[PDB]
Design a protein around this ligand. Structure first.
Ligand SMILES: Nc1ncnc2c1ncn2CCCCNS(=O)(=O)NC(=O)CCCC[C@@H]1SC[C@@H]2NC(=O)N[C@@H]21
Ligand SMILES: Nc1ncnc2c1ncn2CCCCNS(=O)(=O)NC(=O)CCCC[C@@H]1SC[C@@H]2NC(=O)N[C@@H]21
Lengths: 322, 322
């Protein structure tokens, strides 16, 4: 229904109080009968809405579906995010962000319950199971130099890690430069692209995929031993809206840190949260591939590596396997 | 008409021979009467088409309007350009290229007879007079490292300069890093943007604006002393199709040079074609602005500058005025 999101938004905004159906009707300039029909539909879609006879309605719990009217409430209260686009299915939120950013200077994000052509780094396929993960692309407008842009990944990694950690009973670690792990399982990967020239950056687009409630059987046989979800490390039922709120809050906090603090101020924190140390790694560089150890993380965020031939390397980035 | 471009394309492809209206009809599976109606329309739009009684039709000259069916012939015979989009009016060919490149790996360009929101570097307004200039954006897919990408501007500058020089009786010079001049007048500026991350480049988009036939009165009073067009330096009537062909040929040649030769191999040529030497320049760097002289152009394409305080600088880029 056309007013379904608006009814949902009024229910969300009035928590924890009940609102009468009459009040919803006067707000949306529709009939009492249209409001009850919308509320039935929302209940059908799995919204837990308590209705009592003289009080009205109380949104108790959302289903595992993204709802524009709810996310709209998140962007209205965000200084950073001007708006959001919430899709049920899409080729890729990253493809949609790169089209939507052209010709404007807005900061926004794009969410989809499923992706049919999710892509990771180097155009590797990314599994985006409907209803089971957060598939999102974030467009921001950092007015920064190239010598500074690579640090965004280091800061954002810590925000994602903290957001996940808030819901994980197990330790959440960061695999430099763009992987979040729980024990031995990849729970998130992200990818940051930019539109730029030597005069500056028009936008960055950070594509974030986080496995929320996959059962092991929900991962393809090829990635099952290296993928995990937040639910597999949470004694309580993970609530995708509670997590998204925490995740937007940490992204905002770490983005403002990235714009105002040198990497030196999170370097120790980043090292302490990393899981790449004391462990041999597999580096892929075009056709060649070599092994190495992560020795240090310098003040610019570069990984210092000792390869198997004993040579040292200072890497702004790499793709490494365990 | 739906078959107007196809009729035009057949006329172009058969130069310098006449083709009968019957032959056009059998090729397009339309009637002899529809073909003559299309040819009348094309003549109305300013196509010079010779028609003789038993021979058919010969395209003699195109008007100052871009025609998809003609440009299609250019991309079919180009190894590099997969396709093109030809618009009569657009906000900006650069905005359209950045939308069109998403989700594919095609190399292509976008042409528009006019732009309503043309933008140069730093979002400075760009005047795109309808029918008087070439407003185009070129999307390419260089598989190259960032240490190499800045050289593209140096190579492409030489292609544009040569294309213009072929039609100018006066000397065409290059103002580093993205201006083409004829004597004291800016005849072209271009702007190269990229979509990229530390793993590589998804695309570059080179926005090229070239003044073709502006009379001085056609330039705004604010830019008239610093802008010029090719026609103002050509004794013959500049033909936009002949120029576009030459320009696509030089762009292709210099792009392949950029992918296969170090800048050292065009360095002397670039220096010899530059007009920034032996002349004080105005540098703008955020809020500050200083004066300086261009001392050299190193092997990486960096401008070596002596500023007014006597300090040396090595600039991958800058915005400089005369
Ligand atoms: N669900 C999965 N869970 C764990 N492992 C998996 C999964 N599927 C594939 N594998 C294994 C290969 C891992 C790929 N290698 S990677 O590139 O280094 N890693 C990355 O994380 C970069 C991908 C970011 C994804 C986001 S989703 C929203 C946005 N839109 C879009 O299209 N992309 C971004
Ligand atoms: N017609 C003009 N002739 C001479 N001078 C002029 C003119 N109009 C403005 N001025 C003065 C300010 C000069 C601006 N400063 S700049 O940025 O350093 N110079 C540049 O050349 C970069 C602009 C590239 C334009 C292309 S057109 C197709 C594509 N689509 C789009 O939107 N852009 C690109």
């Amino acid at each position: 229904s056309k007013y379904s999101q608006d009814v949902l938004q009024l229910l969300y905004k009035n928590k924890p109080n009940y609102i009468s159906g009459q009040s919803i009707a006067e707000s949306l300039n529709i009939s009492r009968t249209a409001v009850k029909k919308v509320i039935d539909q929302l209940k059908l879609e799995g919204c837990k809405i308590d209705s009592v006879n003289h009080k009205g309605h109380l949104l108790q719990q959302l289903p595992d579906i993204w709802y524009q009217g709810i996310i709209d409430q998140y962007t209205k209260s965000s200084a950073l995010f001007d708006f959001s686009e919430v899709y049920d299915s899409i080729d890729s939120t990253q493809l949609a962000a790169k089209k939507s950013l052209v010709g404007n200077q807005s900061s926004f994000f794009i969410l989809s319950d499923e992706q049919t052509k999710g892509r990771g780094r180097f155009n590797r396929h990314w599994s985006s199971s409907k209803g089971q993960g957060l598939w999102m692309s974030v467009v921001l407008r950092p007015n920064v130099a190239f010598s500074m842009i690579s640090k965004f990944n280091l800061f954002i990694a810590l925000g994602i890690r903290d957001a996940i950690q808030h819901f994980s009973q197990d330790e959440v670690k960061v695999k430099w430069p763009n992987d979040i792990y729980i024990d031995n399982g990849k729970v998130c990967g992200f990818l940051t692209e930019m539109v730029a020239n030597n005069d500056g950056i028009e936008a960055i687009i950070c594509g974030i995929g986080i496995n929320l409630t996959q059962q092991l059987e929900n991962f393809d046989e090829s990635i099952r031993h290296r993928a995990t979800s937040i639910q597999l490390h949470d004694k309580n039922k993970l609530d995708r809206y509670q997590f998204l709120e925490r995740l937007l809050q940490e992204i905002e906090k770490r983005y403002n840190q990235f714009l105002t603090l040198p990497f030196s101020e999170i370097r120790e924190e980043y090292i302490a949260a990393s899981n790449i140390w004391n462990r041999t790694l597999l580096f892929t560089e075009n056709d060649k591939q070599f092994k190495g150890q992560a020795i240090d993380l310098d003040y610019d965020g570069y990984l210092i590596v000792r390869d198997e031939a004993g040579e040292s390397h200072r890497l702004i980035s790499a793709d490494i396997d365990f």
